[PDB]
Design a protein around this ligand. Sequence first.
Ligand SMILES: Cc1ccc(I)cc1
Ligand SMILES: [Ca+2]
Length: 164
Amino acid sequence: MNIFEMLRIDEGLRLKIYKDTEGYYTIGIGHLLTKSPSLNAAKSELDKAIGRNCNGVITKDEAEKLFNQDVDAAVRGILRNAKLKPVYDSLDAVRRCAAINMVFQMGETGVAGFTNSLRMLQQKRWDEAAVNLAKSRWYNQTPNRAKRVITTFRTGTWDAYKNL
Ligand SMILES: Cc1ccc(I)cc1
Ligand SMILES: [Ca+2]
């Protein structure tokens, strides 16, 4: 597929504010609104993001536009990061999608502990990288999604997403 199809499978689509797997207010195709426990704070973030008063509900077009912005922000964060860019540029197109997927889910700060995984990926030691990537809170907390992403890094194919 492509990064949009991959993340749409992993994140789903919901048009009303929901909570992600960590309990944080989210909307659309996995768009984090806030880590605050305040629903009103999440609603304010939503209105700011969409540019109108939504009271917690968006259209599919709005969800898809937010998603495009979020994917682009993940790519640009990789390209501006001196640690991530060299690894990203060493990867083929399918594995670059796996990298964007992780940055979309965890952000640049969430991936900061993956330094050894990043080195193994740049060295193209795929099985070793796959084992190392699984030794993570990420894998333990979202194992099905992590297994799909790890299989993508291990094989360089879309097999985990076609199988699903
Ligand atoms: C975990 C991870 C972070 C950034 C890249 I580029 C690849 C893998
Ligand atoms: Ca999961």
